[PDB]
Amino acid sequence: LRPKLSEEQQRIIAILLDAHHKTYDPTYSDFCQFRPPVRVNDGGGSVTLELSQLSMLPHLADLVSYSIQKVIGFAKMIPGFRDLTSEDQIVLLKSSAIEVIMLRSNESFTMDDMSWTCGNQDYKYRVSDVTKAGHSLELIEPLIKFQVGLKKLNLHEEEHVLLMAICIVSPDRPGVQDAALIEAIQDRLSNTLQTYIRCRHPPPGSHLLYAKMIQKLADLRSLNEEHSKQYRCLSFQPECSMKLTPLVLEVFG
Numbered sequence: 419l420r421p422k423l424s425e426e427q428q429r430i431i432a433i434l435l436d437a438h439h440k441t442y443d444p445t446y447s448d449f450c451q452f453r454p455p456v457r458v459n460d461g462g463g464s465v466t467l468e469l470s471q472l473s474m475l476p477h478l479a480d481l482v483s484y485s486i487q488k489v490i491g492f493a494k495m496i497p498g499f500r501d502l503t504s505e506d507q508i509v510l511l512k513s514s515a516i517e518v519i520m521l522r523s524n525e526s527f528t529m530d531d532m533s534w535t536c537g538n539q540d541y542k543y544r545v546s547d548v549t550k551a552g553h554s555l556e557l558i559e560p561l562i563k564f565q566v567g568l569k570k571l572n573l574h575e576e577e578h579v580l581l582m583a584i585c586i587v588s589p590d591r592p593g594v595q596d597a598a599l600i601e602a603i604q605d606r607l608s609n610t611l612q613t614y615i616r617c618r619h620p621p622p623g624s625h626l627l628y629a630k631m632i633q634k635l636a637d638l639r640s641l642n643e644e645h646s647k648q649y650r651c652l653s654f655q656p657e658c659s660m661k662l663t664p665l666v667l668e669v670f671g
């Protein structure tokens with residue numbers, strides 16, 4: 419059976435598409451406002467050199483900080499999100515921030531050369547740029563694999579925004595108070611996604627797509643964990659806080 423999208427479900431999708439269009443600039447016109455990217459010579463991938471310089475950290479920190487602000491804006495427009503207590507809203511935002519950023523970044527990722535291309539060459543990020551920010555291949559390699567796997571699903575924008583919403587409204591995040599409420603909200607989003615796929619997504623892969631999408635969420639949890647481990651080590655580097663931002667410090671601290 420392929421039940422049609424209810425009037426409410428269609429409304430949820432419209433609201434999410436609008437939220438994304440208002441919080442994701444496909445032209446990346448704000449990027450020149452971030453601290454400039456600095457790419458030092460490190461063809462050997464020296465951890466000692468990378469940690470002593472962290473030349474790309476200021477730029478990527480601003481990029482991520484900026485993105486967290488956009489994510490907060492997006493999340494506030496998710497139907498039902500504002501019904502939660504502020505305590506639960508903040509817990510959900512802090513816990514999923516990095517995951518949603520990895521998800522939304524897929525829009526600028528390109529399989530042409532396995533990079534995130536944001537306009538001009540200065541704003542093209544490769545594996546080597548992330549290592550210059552203090553992160554290791556233990557995170558980067560699985561991240562690139564994740565980006566490629568996601569690109570291959572060829573998600574409709576409707577599916578993409580629903581996935582980010584579902585990721586944020588997760589009842590199994592540490593410290594959530596009203597898990598039942600959060601679960602009701604996520605279920606409404608999950609059923610909307612499942613219905614949209616069986617109804618609007620053409621074959622091949624009509625079905626199976628939902629399961630592959632849910633598995634990506636599991637993949638994100640793992641990446642989240644590894645990122646946290648690496649952030650901790652990074653915070654041990656003297657004078658590192660100045661290269662970040664208050665928002666990044668709170669969310670990842």
Ligand SMILES: C=C1/C(=C\C=C2/CCC[C@]3(C)[C@@H]([C@H](C)/C=C/[C@@H](O)C4CC4)CC[C@@H]23)C[C@@H](O)C[C@@H]1O
Nearest residue numbers: 478479481482485519520522523526534543548551
């Ligand atoms: C942001 C974006 C983005 C790309 C994301 C990237 C490429 C550069 C490295 C990064 C930012 C990794 C990186 C592992 C995270 C890095 C943090 O620890 C930060 C240093 C403070 C996560 C997503 C990935 C560009 C646009 O797609 C908008 C989006 O919100």
